[PDB]
Amino acid sequence: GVECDFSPLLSGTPPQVYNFKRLVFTNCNYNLTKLLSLFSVNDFTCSQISPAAIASNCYSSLILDYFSYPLSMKSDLSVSSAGPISQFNYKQSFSNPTCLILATVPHNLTTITKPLKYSYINKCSRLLSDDRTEVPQLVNANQYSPCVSIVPSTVWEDGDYYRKQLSPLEGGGWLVASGSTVAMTEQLQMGFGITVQYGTDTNSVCPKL
Ligand SMILES: *[C@@H]1O[C@H](CO)[C@@H](O[C@@H]2O[C@H](CO)[C@@H](O)[C@H](O)[C@H]2NC(C)=O)[C@H](O)[C@H]1NC(C)=O
Ligand SMILES: *[C@@H]1O[C@H](CO)[C@@H](O[C@@H]2O[C@H](CO)[C@@H](O)[C@H](O)[C@H]2NC(C)=O)[C@H](O)[C@H]1NC(C)=O
């Protein structure tokens, strides 16, 4: 069989967390250890699987999400934290095994370029018709924030805010968001989210033996 193609991850400027890029793999062979050996891995944690198991099992699919992400914001990735990252930007499946990897890009990994800064959504909210009540708009597993329609791929200025008037068909009211920025680090720091699914006789994403 053919090798899983991880090259988009290694090519060009990775998106910000709320614009995470998604790679989907079926029917291919992988070597996770080899992929990760290109990076300096700072954190590698999983739910319903382990770092050793995720590198050595056969799956019906493997999903890999990737983005620029400052290591300083480690804690904001957890569901248990009610931080803006897990609330408004990026959420992994709660029903399939997952891993989250935080890594630093070495200088000798040249095909990856730095963005100007890190950006994230600090707030995504709906104003109701009473013009008073704001309802947080929590990102769903496997989806973008509804606010990706109004927040640009790079936040221009820390504290910028954004609104969209919604149609009766969309439930009326206003979608409202605010963006934050974090200074670029000496070396680019990234997050990788891996989600796996197991099937019956379709477990064809397998490690290189
Ligand atoms: C998958 O990739 C890993 C990492 O490149 C391979 O293990 C390394 O390669 C050689 C194998 O002779 C060892 O000497 C190193 O100590 C290993 N770790 C490194 C380089 O970090 C591994 O062989 C590959 N697995 C398969 C099944 O091909
Ligand atoms: C490219 O950069 C990598 C990433 O840091 C270098 O690998 C490191 O080498 C040092 C010692 O030389 C180790 O202590 C680190 O643990 C290594 N990093 C990783 C992620 O394994 C590597 O030496 C450089 N390679 C080239 C060809 O320049």
The four Cα atoms 80, 95, 84, 128 give a dihedral, to 10 degrees, of -110
Neighbours of 34 (CB within 10 A): 11
Residue found under tokens 């070597």: 31
Do 105 and 59 belong together in one domain? yes
Rounded to whole angstroms, how far apart are CA atoms 71 and 41?
11
Instruction: CATH number of the domain at 63, please.
Output: 3.30.70.1840
Rounded to whole angstroms, how far apart are CA atoms 134 and 129?
10
Ligand index nearest the alpha carbon of residue 30: 1
For residue 193, what are the CA distances in angstroms to 6, 17, 20, 64, 83? Answer: 13, 11, 9, 6, 17
Residues spanned by the domain of 93: 1-116+184-209
Domain total of the chain: 2
Do 55 and 40 belong together in one domain? yes
Distance of CA 176 to the CA centre of its chain: 21
Do 22 and 64 form a contact (C-beta atoms < 8 A)?
Answer: yes
Q: Is 11 a pocket residue for ligand 2 (Cβ < 6 Å)? A: no
Instruction: CATH number of the domain at 136, please.
Output: 2.20.210.30
Do 139 and 162 belong together in one domain? yes
Q: What was the structure determination method? A: X-ray
Do 110 and 126 belong together in one domain? no
Residue found under tokens 């597993």: 141
Residues in the chain: 209
Do 57 and 130 belong together in one domain? no
Closest C-alpha to 179, from 154, 160, 205, 198: 160
Neighbours of 13 (CB within 10 A): 14
Do 20 and 65 form a contact (C-beta atoms < 8 A)?
Answer: yes
Do 102 and 191 form a contact (C-beta atoms < 8 A)?
Answer: yes
Query: Which mutation among 43, 108, 109, 112 tests ligand 2's pocket best, with the greatest number of atoms within 8 A of CB?
Result: 108
Nearest CA to ligand 1 atom 27: 209
Do 61 and 131 belong together in one domain? no
Ligand 2, atom nearest to 40 Cα: 20
Nearest CA to ligand 2 atom 8: 40
Ligand index nearest the alpha carbon of residue 34: 1
Rounded to whole angstroms, how far apart are CA atoms 166 and 127?
10
Q: What is the resolution of this structure in A?
A: 2.1
Residue found under tokens 């319903």: 48
Do 51 and 102 belong together in one domain? yes
Burial bucket for residue 30 (CB in 10 Å: 0-12, 13-18, 19+): buried
For residue 2, what are the CA distances in angstroms to 6, 27, 65, 135, 207? Answer: 12, 8, 21, 47, 11
Q: Is 108 a pocket residue for ligand 2 (Cβ < 6 Å)? A: yes
> Hey, what long-range contacts does 36-42 have (CB within 8 A, 24 or more apart)?
36/101, 36/103, 38/10, 38/106, 38/109, 39/103, 39/104, 39/105, 39/106, 39/109, 39/190, 40/103, 40/104, 40/105, 40/106, 41/101, 41/102, 41/103, 42/71, 42/102, 42/103, 42/104, 42/189
Do 49 and 104 belong together in one domain? yes
Q: Is 208 a pocket residue for ligand 1 (Cβ < 6 Å)? A: yes
Do 41 and 22 belong together in one domain? yes
